[PDB]
Amino acid sequence: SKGEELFTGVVPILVELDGDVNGHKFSVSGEGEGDATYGKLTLKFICTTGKLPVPWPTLVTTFVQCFSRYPDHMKRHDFFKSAMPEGYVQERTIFFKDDGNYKTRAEVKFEGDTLVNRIELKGIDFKEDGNILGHKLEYNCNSHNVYIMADKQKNGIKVNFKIRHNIEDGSVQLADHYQQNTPIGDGPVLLPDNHYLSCQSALSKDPNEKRDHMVLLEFVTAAGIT
Numbered sequence: 001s002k003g004e005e006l007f008t009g010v011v012p013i014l015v016e017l018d019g020d021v022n023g024h025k026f027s028v029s030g031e032g033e034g035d036a037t038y039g040k041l042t043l044k045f046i047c048t049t050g051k052l053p054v055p056w057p058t059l060v061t062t063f064v065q066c067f068s069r070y071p072d073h074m075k076r077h078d079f080f081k082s083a084m085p086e087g088y089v090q091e092r093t094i095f096f097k098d099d100g101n102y103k104t105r106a107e108v109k110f111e112g113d114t115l116v117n118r119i120e121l122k123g124i125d126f127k128e129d130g131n132i133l134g135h136k137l138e139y140n141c142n143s144h145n146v147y148i149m150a151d152k153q154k155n156g157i158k159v160n161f162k163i164r165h166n167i168e169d170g171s172v173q174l175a176d177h178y179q180q181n182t183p184i185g186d187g188p189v190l191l192p193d194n195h196y197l198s199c200q201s202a203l204s205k206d207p208n209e210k211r212d213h214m215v216l217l218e219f220v221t222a223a224g225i226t
Contacts, residue, residue, distance in 0.1 A: 001075070001078075001081065001082055001190070002082070002084070002085075002187065003066070003080075003081040003082050003083060003084030003085065004075065004078065004081045004082070006081065006084050006085060006110065007034075007036035007037075007066065007067070007081055007084075008036075008037065009035070009037075010033050010034070010035045011033060011034050011035070011036075011067075011113070011114070011115050012031075012032075012033050012113065012114045012115070013030070013031070013032045013033055013034050013041070013043060013064060013067075013114070013115045013116075013117070014029075014030065014031055014111075014114055014115070014116045014117070015028070015029070015030030015031075015032075015043065015045065015063050015064075015116075015117045015119070016028075016029055016030070016116070016117070016118050016119065017029075017030075017059070017062065017063065017118075017119040017120075017121055018119070018120055018121070019054075019059075019119075019120075019121035019122070019123065020121070020122055020123065021053055021054050021100070021102070021121070021122075021123030021124075021126060021132075021133070022100065022123060022124065022125075022126045022128075022133060024053035024054075024133075025049070026047055026049045026050075026052060026053055027047070027048045027049045028045050028046065028047050028048065028052070028059070028063070029045070029046050029048050030043050030044065030045040030046070030063055030117075031043065031044060032044060032216075034064065034067035034115065035067070036066070036067045036068065036069055036070075036081070037069065038069060038219070039067065039068050039069030039219050039220045039221045040067070040069075040217075040218070040219055041064070041067050041216070041217070041218040041219075041220070042216070042217055042218075043063070043215075043216045043218075044206065044209075044213060044214070044215050044216070045059075045063060045213055045214045045215075045216070046209075046211050046212075046213045047211065047212040047213065048211075050212070051212050052212050053133070054123070054132050054133065054135075055131075055132060055135055055136075055137040055139075055165070056139065056203065056214040057137055057138070057139065057140065057141055057165055057203065058094075058096075058102075058132060058137065058165065058175065059121075060141055060201055060203075060214075060216065061092075061094070061163060061175075061177060062092070062094075062102070062104050062106070062119055062121060063117065063119070063216070064080075064108050064115055064117050065080045065090075065146075065197065065220070066080035066081045066083075066084060066108065066115065067115075067220065068080065068197050068220040068221065068222050069220065069221045069222065070222040071221070071222065071223075073225070073226075074195065074222050074223075074225050076190055076192075077148075077190060077192030077193060077195055077222070077225065078190055078192070078222070079148075079150075079156070079157050079181065079189055079190050079191065079192055080108075080181070082188075082189040082190035083181075083183045083184070083185065083187075083189050084109070084110060084115075085109060085110035086109060086183065086184045086185025086187060087107060087108050087109025087110065087183075087184045087185070088107075088108055088109070088156070088181045088182060088183050088184055088189075089105065089106070089107055089108075089181065089182050089183075089184060090104075090105075090106045090107075090108060090179065090180075090181045091103075091104065091105050091106070091179065091180050091181075092104045092177060092178060092179045092180075093177075093178050094163075094175050094176070094177050094178075095175065095176040095178075096126070096130075096131070096132060096173060096174070096175050097173065097174035097175070097176070098130075099125070099126055099127055099130045099131060099132055099173070100123055100124055100125040100126030100127070100130070100132065101123065101124065101125060102121055102122070102123045103121070103122045103123075103124075104119055104120065104121045104122070105119070105120050106118060106119040106120070107184060109184060131165070131167055131173045132173075136167055136168050136169070136173075137165045137166065137167060137168065137173060138165075138166040138167070138168055139203055140166060140203055141165075141200075141201035141202070141203055142163075142164050142165075142166065143198070143199060143200040143201075144161055144162065144163055144164070144199055145161060145196045145197065145198055145199070146159060146161045146196055146197040146199060146220075147159065147160050147161055147194070147196045148192060148194065148195055148196060148197065149192075149194050150191040150192055150193070150194075151180060151181075151182075151191075152191060154180070154182045155182065155183060155189060155191070156180060156181045156182035156183065156189070156191075157180070157181050157191070157192065158179070158180055159177070159178075159179035159180070159181065160176075160177060160178055160179065161177050162174060162175070162176055162177065163175040163176075163177060193225060194224065195222055195223065195224035195225045196222070196223060196224045197220050197221070197222050197223075198220065198221050198222075198223055199218065199219070199220045200218065200219050200220075201216060201217070201218045202216070202217040202218070203215065203216055204216075204217070
């Protein structure tokens, strides 16, 4: 496939986000590389505006599913790579149970040999003392499945999943994700049969980094079809 060939090797990744959560404005710049052959992503994010006003884990899902490893027999269901290099628009509403919500719009595409994820994020209705603005979430990520369905209406896909963020008191903060992706270009894309992506994310810190940041190692494999 067209885009498929663009991911056979290691690809540099750039992530740029501008956010506003309850009036707290911030920006994050991320850099790294992905190797879809192994569904592997390695990235480092820096809050360039100072301190991040929300917990880093809450932004992980927002910060390029085109790096998911699609088994050879499922290659025809890989919408993400099929939309490349022109890219796709990814939109989400993330509902934090008993708290606010993030609405995001991103464009994922190639700029030269670099895969770029440019995001605008808007958060509202958060509680000042809640788990998000109150920073009560653990610095880690649980593993989750991402459910994908074709969205013929918009020549794209509809995606849904639940993310459970660990709260420091041992509880969990649910973040219900509703997502839509549509091609930026007019080229043909692969509309998939229902399947899911099995995801795992490991968060860490760079011991030599004094700026507010997050180091992320992620592995994603598509499954659900034999």
